[PDB]
């Protein structure tokens, strides 16, 4: 029996930028979700389509762990039915989402005096993302009537913008690490079970 490697997901030195959000599939293992949701490390632990207390009694085909960094004020956008730059252009959950959203303050890891500019988000997009879609393209965004032809200027914007993360920001502008666990059911044997 293998224990699910949630530790590797939650403890990675660096997290993905939200526009290029990282995904791991978790399979063929036993997961104790009580160890997770009974941790005081998390400032957000919200489950959708399941009661978190039955999770240790369920089996799924696979579990997915998507992870990335956003600012605190944006954590509310990681839920089904939300709107906003993050939910619309970076990471979208479906309305029938079955899974848990887990977030914690990462000011000590991801901010620096001077600003950590390595974490980015998509500011502009011609249409909303589909659920679980990822957009890693870097085309100049044509905000007005004139085609941009690769050149930046007014109404012609590079679509990705950097977070500013500094440790002295208020909590709304501090980095939060987010892990979204999705529970998948396919026409196949279950491979991830509670204890």
């Amino acid at each position, epitope marked *: 029996t293998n224990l699910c490697p949630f530790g590797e997901v939650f403890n990675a030195t660096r997290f993905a930028s939200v526009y290029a959000w990282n*995904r*791991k*599939r978790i*399979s063929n293992c036993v997961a104790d979700y009580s160890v997770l949701y009974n941790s005081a490390s998390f400032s957000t632990f919200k489950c959708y389509g399941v009661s978190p207390t039955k999770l240790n009694d369920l089996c799924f*085909t*696979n579990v*997915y762990a998507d992870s990335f960094v956003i600012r605190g004020d944006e954590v509310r956008q990681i839920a089904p039915g939300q709107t906003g730059k993050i939910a619309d252009y970076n990471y979208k959950l*479906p309305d029938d989402f079955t899974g848990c959203v887990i977030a914690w303050n990462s000011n000590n890891l991801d901010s620096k005096v001077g600003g950590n500019y390595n974490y980015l988000y998509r500011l502009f997009r011609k249409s909303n993302l*589909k*659920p*679980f*879609e*990822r*957009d*890693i*393209s*870097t*085309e100049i965004y*044509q905000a007005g009537s004139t*085609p941009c032809n*690769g050149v930046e200027g007014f109404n012609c914007y590079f679509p990705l913008q950097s977070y500013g993360f500094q440790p002295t920001n208020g909590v709304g502008y501090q980095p939060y690490r987010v892990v979204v666990l*999705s529970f*998948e059911l*396919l*026409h*196949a044997p279950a491979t991830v079970c509670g204890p």
Partner: antibody
Amino acid sequence: QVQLVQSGAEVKKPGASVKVSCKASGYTFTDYFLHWVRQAPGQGLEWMGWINPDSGGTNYAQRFQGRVTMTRDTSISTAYMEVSRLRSDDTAVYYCARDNERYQMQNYYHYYGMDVWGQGTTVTVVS
Amino acid sequence: QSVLTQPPSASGTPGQRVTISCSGSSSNIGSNTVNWYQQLPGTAPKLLIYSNNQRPSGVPDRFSGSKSGTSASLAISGLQSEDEADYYCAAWDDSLNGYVVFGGGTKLTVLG
């Protein structure tokens, strides 16, 4: 290195079936979907379908629904495509290609392209 | 099923910029990302561009991709003779079951 190695050239009579194989190495076989694409002599690429080696689920192009079966054997990291009721214009090169997005959710699949290609298998259908 | 429309041929000289268009519909390019393949005579296609404008490792920077609305374009900025090849665009089409649609392909000749 990541690679897909296909089985050799096949010559079949009309109405027969053919089964072509595609062995994956250099990565974890179940992490990525596999696509099958064919190309008739002097013509363009034509998608045949995808298989998810993690579940065995498939999505066939409607033109081949009922005539093509894709399968896999994860113990030996190999995908198979069987085409039945062969016609002369099934004569073509058959590619398997790796879906380039790791860890798709099958019920929320997103196609971003195919990054690793087999060398191709010719199938010739003649009496 | 649907088709993606490419010109049957294109050409340019070395040092010139050549563009190849790819026209689709709201259910494929209008909804999904565009990827491009290069096929040299007698060999398997090779991924050139994905996610509208991303280059796989090993693809030189003179290849670029764009998308707007229901169409897309491949640019080769500074043709080299080894770029003589067939080029295909492709995209998911959400119609019915969902399926990959390929362009009809474009033969590029390099007049060098």
